[PDB]
Amino acid sequence: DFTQMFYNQNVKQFWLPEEIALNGDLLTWKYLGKNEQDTYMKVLAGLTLLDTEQGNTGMPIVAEHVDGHQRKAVLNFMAMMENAVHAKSYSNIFMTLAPTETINEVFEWVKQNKYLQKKAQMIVGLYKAIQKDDEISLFKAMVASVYLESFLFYSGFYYPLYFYGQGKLMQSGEIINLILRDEAIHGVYVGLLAQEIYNKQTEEKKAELREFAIDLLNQLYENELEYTEDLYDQVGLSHDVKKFIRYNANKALMNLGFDPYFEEEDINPIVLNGLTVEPLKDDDFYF
Amino acid sequence: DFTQMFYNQNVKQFWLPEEIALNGDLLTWKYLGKNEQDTYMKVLAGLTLLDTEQGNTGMPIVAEHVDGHQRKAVLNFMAMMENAVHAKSYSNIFMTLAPTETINEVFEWVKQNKYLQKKAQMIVGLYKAIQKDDEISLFKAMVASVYLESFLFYSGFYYPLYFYGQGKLMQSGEIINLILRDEAIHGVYVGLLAQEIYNKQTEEKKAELREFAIDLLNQLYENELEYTEDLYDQVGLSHDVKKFIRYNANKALMNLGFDPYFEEEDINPIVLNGLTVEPLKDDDFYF
Amino acid sequence: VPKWIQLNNEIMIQKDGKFQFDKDKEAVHSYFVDYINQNTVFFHNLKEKLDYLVENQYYEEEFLSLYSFEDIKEVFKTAYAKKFRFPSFMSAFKFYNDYALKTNDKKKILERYEDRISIVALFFANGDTEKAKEYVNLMINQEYQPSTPTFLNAGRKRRGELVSCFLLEVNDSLNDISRAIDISMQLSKLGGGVSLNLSKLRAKGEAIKDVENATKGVVGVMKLLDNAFRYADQMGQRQGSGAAYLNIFHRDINDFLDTKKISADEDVRVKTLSIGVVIPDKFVELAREDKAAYVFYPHTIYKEYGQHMDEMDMNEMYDKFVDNPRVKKEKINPRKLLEKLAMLRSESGYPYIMFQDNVNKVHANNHISKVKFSNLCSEVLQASQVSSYTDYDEEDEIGLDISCNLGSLNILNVMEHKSIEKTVKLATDSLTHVSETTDIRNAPAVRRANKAMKSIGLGAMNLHGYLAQNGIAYESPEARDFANTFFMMVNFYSIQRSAEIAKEKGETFDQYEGSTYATGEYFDKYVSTDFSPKYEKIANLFEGMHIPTTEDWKKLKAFVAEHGMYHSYRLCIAPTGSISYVQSSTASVMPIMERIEERTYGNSKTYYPMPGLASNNWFFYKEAYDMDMFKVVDMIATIQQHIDQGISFTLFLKDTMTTRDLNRIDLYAHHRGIKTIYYARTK
Amino acid sequence: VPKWIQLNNEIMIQKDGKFQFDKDKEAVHSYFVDYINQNTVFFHNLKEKLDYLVENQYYEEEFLSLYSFEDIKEVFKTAYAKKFRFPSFMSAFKFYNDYALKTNDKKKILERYEDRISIVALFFANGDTEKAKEYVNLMINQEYQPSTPTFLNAGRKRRGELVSCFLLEVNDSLNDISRAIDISMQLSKLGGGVSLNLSKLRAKGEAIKDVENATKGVVGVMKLLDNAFRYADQMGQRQGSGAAYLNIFHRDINDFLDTKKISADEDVRVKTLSIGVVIPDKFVELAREDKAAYVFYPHTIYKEYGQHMDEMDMNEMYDKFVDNPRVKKEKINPRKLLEKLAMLRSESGYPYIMFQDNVNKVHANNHISKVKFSNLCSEVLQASQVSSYTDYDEEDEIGLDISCNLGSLNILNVMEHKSIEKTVKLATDSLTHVSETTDIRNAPAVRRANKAMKSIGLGAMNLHGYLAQNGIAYESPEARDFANTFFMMVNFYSIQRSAEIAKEKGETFDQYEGSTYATGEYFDKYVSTDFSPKYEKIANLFEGMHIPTTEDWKKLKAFVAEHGMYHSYRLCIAPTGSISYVQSSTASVMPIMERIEERTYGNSKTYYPMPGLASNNWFFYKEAYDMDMFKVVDMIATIQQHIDQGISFTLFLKDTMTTRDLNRIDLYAHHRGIKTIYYARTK
Ligand SMILES: Nc1ncnc2c1ncn2[C@@H]1O[C@H](COP(=O)(O)OP(=O)(O)OP(=O)(O)O)[C@@H](O)[C@H]1O
Ligand SMILES: Cc1cn([C@H]2C[C@H](O)[C@@H](COP(=O)(O)OP(=O)(O)OP(=O)(O)O)O2)c(=O)[nH]c1=O
Ligand SMILES: Cc1cn([C@H]2C[C@H](O)[C@@H](COP(=O)(O)OP(=O)(O)OP(=O)(O)O)O2)c(=O)[nH]c1=O
Ligand SMILES: [Mg+2]
Ligand SMILES: [Mg+2]
Ligand SMILES: [Mn+2]
Ligand SMILES: [Mn+2]
Ligand SMILES: [Mn+2]
Ligand SMILES: [Mn+2]
Grouping H, G, I as helix, E, B as strand and the rest as coil, residue C342 is helix
Ligand 2 atom nearest to C174, measured from its CA: 13
Angle of helix A3-12 relative to helix A69-80, nearest 10 degrees, comes to 20
Calculate ∠ Cα A42-A46-A47, nearest 5°.
120
CA C189 to the chain's CA centroid: 19
Strand partners, C194: C166, C242
- Of all residues in chain C, the one with the smallest CA distance to D212 is C235
Ligand 2 close to Cβ of residue D232 (< 6 A): yes
Three-class SS string for C60-114? Answer: CHHHHCCCCHHHHHHHHHHHHHCCCCCCCHHHHHHHHHHHCCECCCCCCECCCHH
Quick check: A170 and A164 in contact, CB under 8 A? yes
Grouping H, G, I as helix, E, B as strand and the rest as coil, residue B221 is helix
Indicate the top mutation candidate among D189, D227, D230, D241 to test ligand 2's pocket, ranked by most ligand atoms within 8 A of CB. D189
Grouping H, G, I as helix, E, B as strand and the rest as coil, residue C30 is helix
Quick check: C610 and C596 in contact, CB under 8 A? yes
Annotated active-site residue in C161, C379, C475, C478: C379
Ligand 1 atom nearest to D87, measured from its CA: 1
Torsion-angle region of residue C389: left (phi > 0), alpha (psi -120 to 50) or beta? beta
**Sheet strands (E) in D349-401:** 352-355
Question: For chain B, which residues make up each domain, given as ranges?
Answer: 1-275
Distances (CA, A) of B133 to B56, B66, B142, C536: 22, 9, 15, 87
Torsion-angle region of residue D544: left (phi > 0), alpha (psi -120 to 50) or beta? left
Distance D215 CA to ligand 3 centre (A): 7
Nearest to D667 among B27, B277, B285 (CB): B285
> Cβ of A11 and B16 within 8 Å?
yes
In a 10 Å sphere around its CB, with 0-12 CB exposed, 13-18 middle and 19+ buried, how is residue B132 labelled?
Answer: exposed
Distance A151 CA to ligand 7 centre (A): 11
Grouping H, G, I as helix, E, B as strand and the rest as coil, residue C397 is strand
Binding residues of C: 148, 164-165, 193, 375-379, 575-579
**Sheet strands (E) in C201-357:** 242-247, 273-279, 293-296, 329-332, 352-355
Q: Which helix (H) or strand (E) holds D274?
A: strand D273-279
Ligand 3 close to Cβ of residue D132 (< 6 A): no
Grouping H, G, I as helix, E, B as strand and the rest as coil, residue B238 is helix
The reply, when asked if residue D409 is annotated as ligand binding, is: no
Cβ contacts of C128-133, under 8 Å, gap ≥ 24: C129/C67, C129/C71, C129/C74, C129/C75, C131/C429, C132/C67, C132/C71, C132/C75, C133/C74, C133/C75, C133/C78
- Strands C596-601 and D456-461 come out as unpaired
Annotated active-site residue in B7, B31, B40, B90: B90
Q: Which helix (H) or strand (E) holds C168?
A: strand C165-169
Nearest-Å Rg of the Cα atoms of chain A is 21
> Cβ of A79 and B77 within 8 Å?
no
Residue of C433, C372, C399 whose CA lies nearest to C567: C433
CATH code, B1-275: 1.10.620.20
Min Cα separation A48/chain D (Å): 24
Quick check: B238 and B244 in contact, CB under 8 A? no
Q: How far apart are CA C386 and CA C171, in angstroms?
A: 6
Quick check: D145 and D579 in contact, CB under 8 A? yes
Is A184 at the interface with chain D, CB within 8 A?
A: no
Quick check: D245 and D200 in contact, CB under 8 A? no
**End-to-end CA gap in chain A:** 38
Question: Which amino acid, D355?
Answer: F
Contacts of C566 (CB under 8 A, 6+ apart): C432, C454, C498, C499, C501, C502, C505, C507, C508, C509
- Total residues belonging to chain B: 287
> Cβ of A280 and C668 within 8 Å?
no
Q: How far apart are CA C411 and CA C482, in angstroms?
A: 11
Ligand 3 close to Cβ of residue D490 (< 6 A): no
| Best residue in B76, B78, B89, B182 for a mutation probing chain A (most A CBs within 10 Å) | B76
Q: Which helix (H) or strand (E) holds C144?
A: strand C144-146
- Strands C604-609 and C596-601 come out as antiparallel
Q: DSSP per residue over B29-51, as a string?
A: HHTS-HHHHHHHHHHHHHHHHHH
Nearest-Å Rg of the Cα atoms of chain D is 25
Q: How far apart are CA B110 and CA B87, in angstroms?
A: 14
Grouping H, G, I as helix, E, B as strand and the rest as coil, residue C676 is strand
CA C514 to the chain's CA centroid: 26
B90 classed as catalytic: yes
Helices (H) and strands (E) in chain D, counts: 29, 15
Nearest to D181 among C181, C189, C441 (CB): C181
Q: Which helix (H) or strand (E) holds D344?
A: helix D334-348
As a whole number of angstroms, the longest Cα–Cα distance in chain D is 80
Q: Which helix (H) or strand (E) holds D484?
A: helix D477-505
Annotated active-site residue in C153, C377, C491, C663: C377
Distance B70 CA to ligand 9 centre (A): 18
CA D207 to the chain's CA centroid: 38
Q: In chain A, which residues have their Cβ closer than 8 Å to the Cβ of D348? A: none
Quick check: C332 and C294 in contact, CB under 8 A? yes
Q: How far apart are CA D338 and CA D353, in angstroms?
A: 11
Quick check: A274 and A169 in contact, CB under 8 A? no
Q: How far apart are CA C368 and CA C514, in angstroms?
A: 8
As annotated, the active-site residues of D are 375, 377, 379
Q: How far apart are CA D616 and CA D68, in angstroms?
A: 50
Q: How far apart are CA C17 and CA C3, in angstroms?
A: 24
- Which residues lie with the beta carbon below 6 Å from any ligand 1 atom? D 28-29, 32-33, 37, 83, 85-86, 92
- Total residues belonging to chain C: 683
For chain D, how are helix, strand and coil distributed in percent, rounded to 5? Answer: 45, 15, 40
Ligand 2 close to Cβ of residue C375 (< 6 A): no
Q: How far apart are CA D212 and CA D653, in angstroms?
A: 44
Residue of C75, C84, C68, C91 whose CA lies nearest to C4: C91
Question: Which amino acid, D537?
Answer: K
Q: In chain A, which residues have their Cβ closer than 8 Å to the Cβ of B87? A: 69, 73
Calculate ∠ Cα D338-D343-D349, nearest 5°.
105
Ligand 2 close to Cβ of residue C370 (< 6 A): no
Q: Which helix (H) or strand (E) holds C28?
A: helix C23-31
Q: Which helix (H) or strand (E) holds D180?
A: helix D174-189
Residue of C636, C632, C624 whose CA lies nearest to C593: C624
Q: Which helix (H) or strand (E) holds D6?
A: helix D3-9
Residue D172 main-chain phi, psi, to 5 deg: -85, 75
Is A203 at the interface with chain C, CB within 8 A?
A: no
As a whole number of angstroms, the longest Cα–Cα distance in chain B is 73
CA B261 to the chain's CA centroid: 20
Q: DSSP per residue over chain A, as a string?
A: --HHHHHHHHHHT---GGGB--GGGHHHHTTS-HHHHHHHHHHHHHHHHHHHHIIIIIHHHHHHH---HHHHHHHHHHHHIIIIIIHHHHHHHHHHHS-HHHHHHHHHHHHH-HHHHHHHHHHHHHHHT--TT-HHHHHHHHHHHHHIIIIITHHHHHHHHHHHTTTSSHHHHHHHHHHHHHHHHHHHHHHHHHHHHHTTS-HHHHHHHHHHHHHHHHHHHHHHHHHHHHHHGGGT-HHHHHHHHHHHHHHHHHHTTPPP-S------HHHHHH-------SSTT--
Grouping H, G, I as helix, E, B as strand and the rest as coil, residue D633 is helix
Binding residues of C for substrate: 148, 164-165, 193, 375-379, 575-579
Q: Which helix (H) or strand (E) holds D457?
A: strand D456-461
Residue of C331, D47, D492 whose CA lies nearest to D484: D492
Q: Which chains touch D (3 or more CB pairs under 8 A)?
A: A, B, C
For chain D, which domains are there?
3-142 (no CATH), 143-280+334-683 (3.20.70.20), 281-333 (no CATH)
**What is the count of residue pairs from B and D with beta carbons less than 8 Å apart?**
35
